[PDB]
Amino acid sequence: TPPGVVMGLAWTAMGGSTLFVETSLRRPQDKDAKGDKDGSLEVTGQLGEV
Amino acid sequence: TPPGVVMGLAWTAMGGSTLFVETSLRRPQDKDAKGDKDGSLEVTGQLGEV
């Protein structure tokens, strides 16, 4: 389980299942020590709106 | 072709098949080396959402 991944139970249509969840950087972080812009999240994985 | 393709097997509706994925540059790369506006993809091929 390298950092930024965690187990997560889920109650799918037929029984439970132990699907993982994962996250990662998208661009190198220190583009600017002085920068000020939202570090916007980008969700992925066939998300429902809720 | 050396830059930008790789043969890709795929399980088409009838038999297998050998589709090529192809990618290319879209604009001169270095108009401003010091800037920070990440290069968007544009995907094609009539992909479904998944």
Next chain:
Amino acid sequence: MKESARIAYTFARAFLMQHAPANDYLVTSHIHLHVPEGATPKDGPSAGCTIVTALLSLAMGRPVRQNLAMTGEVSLTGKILPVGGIKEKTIAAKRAGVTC
């Protein structure tokens, strides 16, 4: 058609920097393009190659050579592909005065 148009545009913008680097008319220029409807929809990609030369003509300023029709599909690296229904195409273009 939108798909084929986009890929053709990208190939055009790529070929020009590959060939004539100093020109940049196409990298920065809003450009309307008009492809009249009438091609059978399954055959609709077949016209793709023509666009890629159309744009190039405008990007260099030379009018095309006289009465020289062409067709065929293109790929992002420029490997042209076979297109069907050649017979109807030949018989129709023959009487338009096309020669090459």
